[PDB]
Design a protein around this nucleic acid. Structure first.
Ligand SMILES: Cc1cc2nc3c(=O)[nH]c(=O)nc-3n(C[C@H](O)[C@H](O)[C@H](O)COP(=O)(O)OP(=O)(O)OC[C@H]3O[C@@H](n4cnc5c(N)ncnc54)[C@H](O)[C@@H]3O)c2cc1C
Ligand SMILES: [Zn+2]
Ligand SMILES: [Zn+2]
Ligand SMILES: [Zn+2]
Lengths: 80, 99, 737, 105, 96, 12, 26, 98, 113, 99, 85
DNA sequence: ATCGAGAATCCCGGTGCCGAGGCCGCTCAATTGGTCGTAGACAGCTCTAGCACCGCTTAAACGCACGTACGCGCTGTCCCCCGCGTTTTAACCGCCAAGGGGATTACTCCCTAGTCTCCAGGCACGTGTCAGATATATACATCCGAT
DNA sequence: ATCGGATGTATATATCTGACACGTGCCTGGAGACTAGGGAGTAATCCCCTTGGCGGTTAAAACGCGGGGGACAGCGCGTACGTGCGTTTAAGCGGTGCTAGAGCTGTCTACGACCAATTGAGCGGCCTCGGCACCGGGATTCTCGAT
């Protein structure tokens, strides 16, 4: 239940702490779940498109490293 | 005797030294995994994931959010403010071209 | 599951679910958790989940509502809020007189004002005989409200359309919702400059917190009911607003509606007593009294039947309080006195202008009477003897300088105390001379004469030569929010309002009070011919001049403090002349303007007919009115009416030099200065004086002797409105006792 | 060992396969995989060198991806070659904006 | 039955690490990151060789196109030493 | 702020 | 008082204007 | 003056033909025609390259219409993907019926 | 002994107006795959015909709605930049002689009454 | 009676014109000499087709114009209506221009 | 020659020319030091673009930069520009 | 508060002229029609790796109080930049000159696909350490009052 | 502005344990030695299209001069969120089970290059006029300084 809300307010605090953000306002967390939601919607949509084309029921990691490469967000450490 | 406490910002700045200093993955793996599956159910149903792919989407989540707080933080500092606000998030997203 | 409630201290020994939304609803049985809305209202964990959980059928309905509640409100959309706003059954009270039982409506029924207005038990055996749900009584326990989770939010409030600029839930209305007299603007709008008789929709006034302390923590319910009440009053100001009329317009779900209905009566009576509603010329008779029998036992003598005395008398009478009015003259009205003998027009010998109609009691009373006022236009040409209309650039140049002089006065006074006060006129003069000295600039004789006009206009306003009026305090009242909007000519005259206020009251004419004795159990009042009156309380509304003359013997005597305040104000004076003509000789030159100015030949003569008023806004009849102010009031005291008329006609023939002027066929000249029971026009602050004087004069003595009148209203001195409001003020004070 | 025919330590034949079997041209000349192998050995060499010194600064012996993170992001040119590339388990350089530094007496 | 395989660069990356700081090891995540790094640069340079050959009406990738494409990708100083090592390996190749 | 207060509701 | 003036109102000498800034405002 | 030039290609008469299909009585300027020409080339190497590496991932060596359907479902944003796939299947089947 | 057999070309065969042979040659001659299938440039020519028809359609609507009878590249600028999805396909592409679609920030508009 | 409209009527009206027009702004020969001067550093004695100079003109104006779009959003996000050079530095840094 | 000296090497982008580009961008008020920084940014952009373009002109061993040269080099930097090829 | 110079902007009308559109030859790339090895759909196994489930500990998430400091609106004060006349001045334009270098066509020829076999390089696969996390106890570095 | 709890953080020391550097075996892809058609270096020419110069006008740029409004420092006042402590609570762990589907390997087959003759189709040269500029005149609208 409430998969999105599962991104905790301390987790968004922690990512802001790694980013070098001192103080966090009120409605930051709603928009943060929204932005993360949009980004994962695009990446998952393109990964599913990469996975239906091989006609395979299982999404692998090379699928999504390819999908991150194509959106100009290349990520090493999983092959390819 | 009861004060001890700290300023609002010592725990923040020391916390910036720690969480900039360390490297590990820090959104919890089962709520994130359920989140990726529930977003994944919309485009197609009855899915299966490798575990390291969920690690990989976790890396894209931390990279994209963390970099968005880099640019959002420079946005709000450029307003002579030390506290970020949602219009700054909206600004850096329009500057990167995310609308 | 359990049978117990989450809330600590809840007396619900058997929670049942009101929602029954989930096919899995627990009803009266076991559930993992009972969610509490009030001591009598709960919903089970299943129905909670039904809306709260994404995989449940009621989630859509809860997310949509959660969105509207976001584009519309400032409170967090919780499931409990959704429940109280969307699912809680309505309750309505049976209207059968001998029943009056409260009934729960079935969950699909949407309560409306029409339903509430006529509802009887059973409206879809003796349905009225079925016992009332035991939960209803509970609502009238003071702790009942304390265990309400969220405050009531009204639906479709009559106040709503007047408050579209506020977050509905900040003024006691629900975010999920949605031809008045233009002068009715009871609520402050966000970011507005002050204006008279406005209330904040979202904040309780000081007197309100005083009367209803239990709302200081959360004023939500009060504000909603108060705002609704005002909206209803202004929607129809021709009838007494009663609880019966309000109740149908209170729409909110849940048992809380019962608590709202129970509170409306308390707030209604407070609003009435204070003079916010059920006021003006509204008349109410035996078995229609506006306040409970609890206020009725008491008695009052009101001295003076001008706007102040008649306001208080009207209020007290409508309240059900025993009132007798003693008036010195052979007529009521005081400084309101209209001449109805002029052809097709009513001309005031006294007051006739309304200064700022927005929220003005006078505007309300015109509404109640179906009277129309004439709004003055702006144009007022400055015409010279003899004939020449003043050059627009000269006009603008001297207006600027005149007001610049006022700026520096206001700057000079900032650090001066009453003990250092100097006359406004003297101050202006000095600043003027010291300016011509400083800057080599030199004004023509005409430019100097135009400045004199403006000075004259100040003297008219204060009812005094400027060398008598305080530089520090002349405009003291503007510290407070003033009446905004149109200035109008009350074409039918103030007398219509006066008549209406006095109609049916116990008024004794030709009864000048000479003695007031409040040393015994009740006040003994004796007239000049020895006639005795007595009552528990007395209100004096006699003009400032009469207090200054000491025409009434007080025992015990007024305090030294009061006497100092009384003498620190000036009994200001102006006189009026009205002239009737065979035809409208001024139309060519004046071109429809409501008035025209008269440039003074000299400083000494400046207050001699400075402004002429066209007394027929329909431009059909030929009556002019003019005023005598400042020094000129003195110059006229030994002249008979004919002589004054001669000087006015000589003035007009100068102002209209290049044309002929017909003889007047009818006229009057007022002598307020020498009317024994009045002796003035309106108060002002004399040099050395403070606005606080108005408050000090206003102060009751031992809750036994009260004071009203224009010279007791610090916010709104001088005016019929101000006098009227001082009477309403005192009626409230007297009725509280 | 055509690496030994050229004095390098990269697979000329495997890279040569990968140029021929990716459909880039219709045909691939002789000297080209020697050239590309030399370039990649250069780039590999200094990136592992900066991970070498910046690995010794953590007093370790095994380079972990943190050392590749700041080893890339410290030099300008390697950062500009890799400015759109996320490194997994990398983190950030300790950048702190100067207004956040708590000043006083 | 055993199983297929799939090549890498890990032995070669290990060899250059032995050239530079020889008594200092390497961890496996960093090894796979270096692996996908050199695949990334390999596809950038081979891709630029494709886009550069696809302009001059030529269908052959000799070393000179790799020289130009390196002089477009790599910025400045490491382009100079990269191309200089490339001439060292062409000339050191063919002089043998 | 005394300025704005409603005249009939500030008589304390 | 100044407020008695209808024709040709004076304007100089007025204190600064105050403006209600409530939070209940949308 | 009198010498062989150099055969050349384009898309310009085809863009002119689709202009005749959509708004049949309406002109087009020359630099706009070269804009559309470079547009058609740009999209053409976009989905051609996406077909290249998208066919390279699955260890194939052949570009068929399933690959172009996937690659159009990667570059074309959403509503623009769907009608492109409907016209694409209509042209595959409408071709195949002969 | 004949190579005639009704000449039905390729474009028509599919009912389009794009060169299947020229696009087909361009798929074989850019080294994208060693083999190129049967009906691939049929599909791809369909996609490009849809896209061409969309952009020229919106430049036609804007072409009447700014009172000309001829598409200039300015109409391709505000033709493309007004649909959301065509802008998202072309968001990194400048088109010459395009200029800027008229955007004015809210604080620049005058603070009148 | 000379009387200029104001600081903003020439501005906003002239924004309506120079947004509304289409042509290329900075002049042909100084820009051409600029491209040749920067061109002399990497190689001596070059030659340009004229349309290529128009091409560098077009991409250069479009890159500067987009930079003023974004630095305008930057300075408006400071509640200012004036471009200042640190805003230019921000958008070059936020976008990624700042090497 | 009648005057017409260098006076301004890379300052051709006159002050009103940068005003005209900014007002195409929708910019109301321009500060003072904007112009020198604008010349700097334009200089950096052109240095990268024709540094990359001159290499395309050198690879064909040709001494004349063409339009296809700079459109290709603009395409590679992710700033593709139609209307020339 | 609302009304006129007047200046910029928009609405028709002849002109012109030239760039958009169309027409006539015409090389060559599409087209049609067969083959052919082969890439790939297709079937079936396999086993392994993803999914499901259940109990325990607990780090982490949640929630209440609280206070101060960060946001933000008002105030003044300066100046830098906007606006507009006046000079100048160098860009734009037409045309005239010269050739250096792009495009073309041909010529010759080295060179890189293509084949077949030969072998060791790397790569799968056990293996056992020495590098690092993890306590674990221990003395500095700087924070935060309180003086 | 100094001093001391204190307190989080840097500094040896063991310790298990396991991830990596390494040794054994193998098999197939690197390579080696040929051939052959063709891609491309290389020459020479055609001419054209870039560069250069020079005079004549002048839109644009430069520059001086008001002046006001926009940046910005101070400053007061609210509120919201960082800090820290008690409560919970479900995430991690860690084992256990089940089988769906990735992956392998083999089967058989419909399909894309290879040539190779056949031809109209798009393209360049070359007309030709109508739509956009484009002055040129003229009523509208909006702004800005007045009431
Ligand atoms: C010429 C003139 C022009 C004015 N213009 C305006 C105007 O344009 N607009 C406006 O708003 N106002 C105007 N005013 C002022 C306005 O009329 C007064 O402010 C208002 O009437 C005062 O109200 P009042 O009730 O206090 O007193 P009053 O009107 O003065 O009445 C007091 C009553 O007390 C009575 N009284 C006195 N002594 C005794 C006694 N001993 N025993 C019994 N009764 C006694 C008097 O007879 C009188 O009836 C004007 C007044 C005048 C005279
Ligand atoms: Zn229920
Ligand atoms: Zn309860
Ligand atoms: Zn009943």
């Amino acid at each position: 239940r409430d998969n999105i809300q599962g991104i905790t307010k301390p987790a968004i605090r922690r990512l802001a702490r790694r980013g070098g953000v001192k103080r966090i306002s009120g409605l930051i967390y709603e928009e943060t779940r929204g932005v993360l939601k949009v980004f994962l919607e695009n990446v998952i949509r393109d990964a599913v498109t990469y996975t239906e084309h091989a006609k395979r029921k299982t999404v692998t990691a090379m699928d999504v490293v390819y999908a991150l490469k194509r959106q100009g967000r290349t990520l090493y450490g999983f092959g390819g | 005797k009861k004060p001890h406490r700290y300023r609002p910002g010592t725990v923040a700045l020391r916390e910036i030294r720690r969480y900039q200093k360390s490297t590990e993955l820090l959104i919890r793996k089962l709520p994130f995994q359920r989140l990726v599956r529930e977003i994944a159910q919309d485009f197609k149903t009855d899915l299966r994931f490798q575990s390291s792919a969920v690690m990989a989407l976790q890396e894209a989540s931390e990279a994209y959010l963390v970099a968005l707080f880099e640019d959002t933080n420079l946005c709000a500092i450029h307003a002579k403010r030390v506290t970020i606000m949602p219009k700054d998030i909206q600004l850096a997203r329009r500057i990167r071209g995310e609308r | 599951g359990s049978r117990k409630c989450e809330k600590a201290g809840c007396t619900a020994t058997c929670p049942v679910c009101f929602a029954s939304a989930s096919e899995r609803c627990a009803k009266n049985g076991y559930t993992s958790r009972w969610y509490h809305l009030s001591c009598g209202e709960h919903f089970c964990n299943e129905c909670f989940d039904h809306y709260y959980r994404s995989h449940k059928d009621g989630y859509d309905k809860y997310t949509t509502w959660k969105k509207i509640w976001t584009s519309n409100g400032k409170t967090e959309p919780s499931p409990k809020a959704f429940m109280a706003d969307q699912q809680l059954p309505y309750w309505v009270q049976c209207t059968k007189p001998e029943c009056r039982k409260w009934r729960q409506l079935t969950k699909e029924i949407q309560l409306t004002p029409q339903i509430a207005k006529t509802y009887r038990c059973g409206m879809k055996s003796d349905h009225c005989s079925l016992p009332e749900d035991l939960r209803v009584l509970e609502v009238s326990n003071h702790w009942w409200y304390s265990m309400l989770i969220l405050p009531p939010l009204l639906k479709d409030s009559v106040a709503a359309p007047l408050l579209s600029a506020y977050y509905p839930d900040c003024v006691g209305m629900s975010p999920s919702c949605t031809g008045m007299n233009r002068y009715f603007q009871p609520f402050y709008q966000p970011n507005e400059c002050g204006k008279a008789l406005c209330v904040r929709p979202d904040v309780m006034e000081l007197d309100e917190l005083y009367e209803f302390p239990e709302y200081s923590r959360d004023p939500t319910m009060y504000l909603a009911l108060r705002n609704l009440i005002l909206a209803l009053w202004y929607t129809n100001c021709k009838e007494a607003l009663t609880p019966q009329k309000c109740i149908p317009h209170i729409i909110v779900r849940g048992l809380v509606r019962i608590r709202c209905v129970q509170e409306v009566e308390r707030i209604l009576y407070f609003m009435t007593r204070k003079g916010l509603i059920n006021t003006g010329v509204l008349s109410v008779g035996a078995d229609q009294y506006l306040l409970p029998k609890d206020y009725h036992n008491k008695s009052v003598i009101i001295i003076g039947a001008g706007p102040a005395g008649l306001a208080a008398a009207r209020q007290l009478h409508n309240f059900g309080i025993k009132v007798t009015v003693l008036e010195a003259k052979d007529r009521i009205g005081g400084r309101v006195w209209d001449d109805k003998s002029f052809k097709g027009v009513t001309v005031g010998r006294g007051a006739q202008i309304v200064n700022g109609c927005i929220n003005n009691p006078v505007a309300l009373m015109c509404e109640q009477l179906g009277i129309s006022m004439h709004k003055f236009g702006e144009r007022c040409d400055l015409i010279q003897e003899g004939g020449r209309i003043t050059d627009p650039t000269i006009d603008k140049r001297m207006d600027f300088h005149f007001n610049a002089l006022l700026d520096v006065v206001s700057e000079w006074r900032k650090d001066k105390t009453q003990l250092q006060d100097v006359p406004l006129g003297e101050k202006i003069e000095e600043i003027y001379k010291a300016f011509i000295k400083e800057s080599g600039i030199q004004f023509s004789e005409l430019e100097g004469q135009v400045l004199q006009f403006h000075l004259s206009n100040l003297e008219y306003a204060c009812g005094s030569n400027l060398h008598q009026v305080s530089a520090r305090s002349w405009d003291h009242n503007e510290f407070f929010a003033q009446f905004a909007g149109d200035h109008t000519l009350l074409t039918p005259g103030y007398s219509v309002i006066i008549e209406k206020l006095a109609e049916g009251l116990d008024i004794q004419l030709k009864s000048p009070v000479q003695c007031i004795d409040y040393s015994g159990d009740e006040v003994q009042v004796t007239t000049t011919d020895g006639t005795g009156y007595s009552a528990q309380k007395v209100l004096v509304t006699v003009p400032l001049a009469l207090l200054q003359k000491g025409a009434i013997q007080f025992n015990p005597p007024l305090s030294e403090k009061k006497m100092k305040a009384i003498n620190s104000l000036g009994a200001g004076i102006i006189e009026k002349i009205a002239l009737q003509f065979p035809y409208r000789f001024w139309d060519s030159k004046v071109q429809g303007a409501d008035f025209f100015g008269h440039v003074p030949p000299s400083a000494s003569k400046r207050g001699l007919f400075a402004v002429f008023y066209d007394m027929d806004p329909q431009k059909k009849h030929s009556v002019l009115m003019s005023v005598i102010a400042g020094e000129a009031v003195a110059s006229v005291r030994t002249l008979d009416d004919k002589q004054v008329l001669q000087q006015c006609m000589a003035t007009l023939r100068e102002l209209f030099k290049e044309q002929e002027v017909p003889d007047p066929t009818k006229y009057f000249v007022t002598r307020w200065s020498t009317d024994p029971w009045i002796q003035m026009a309106y108060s002002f602050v004399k040099t050395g004086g403070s606005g606080e004087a108005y408050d000090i004069i206003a102060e009751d003595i031992q809750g036994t002797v009260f004071f009203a009148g224009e010279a007791t209203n610090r916010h709104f001195p001088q005016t019929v409105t101000g006098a009227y409001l001082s009477g309403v003020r005192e009626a409230s004070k007297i009725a509280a006792f | 060992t055509r690496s030994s025919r050229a004095g390098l330590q990269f697979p000329v034949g495997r890279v040569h396969r990968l140029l021929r079997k990716g459909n880039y041209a219709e045909r691939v000349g002789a000297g080209a995989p020697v050239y590309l192998a030399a370039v990649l050995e250069y780039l590999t060499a200094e990136i592992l060198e900066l991970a070498g010194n910046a690995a010794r600064d953590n007093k370790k012996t095994r380079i972990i991806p943190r050392h590749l993170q700041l080893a890339v992001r410290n030099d300008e040119e390697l950062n500009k070659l890799l400015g759109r590339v996320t490194i997994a388990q990398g983190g950030v350089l300790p950048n702190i904006q100067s207004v956040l530094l708590p000043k006083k007496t | 039955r055993r199983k297929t395989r799939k090549e890498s660069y890990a032995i070669y990356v290990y060899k250059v690490l032995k050239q530079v700081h020889p008594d200092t090891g390497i961890s496996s995540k960093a090894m796979s990151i270096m692996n996908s790094f050199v695949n990334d640069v390999f596809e950038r340079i081979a891709g630029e060789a494709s886009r550069l050959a696809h302009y001059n009406k030529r269908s052959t990738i000799t070393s000179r196109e790799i020289q130009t494409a390196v002089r477009l990708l790599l910025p400045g100083e490491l382009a100079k030493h990269a191309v200089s090592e490339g001439t060292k390996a062409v000339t050191k190749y063919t002089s043998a | 702020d005394p300025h704005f207060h409603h005249f009939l509701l500030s008589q304390t | 008082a100044r407020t008695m003036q209808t024709a040709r109102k004076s304007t100089g000498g007025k204190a600064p204007r105050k403006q209600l800034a409530t939070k209940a405002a949308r």
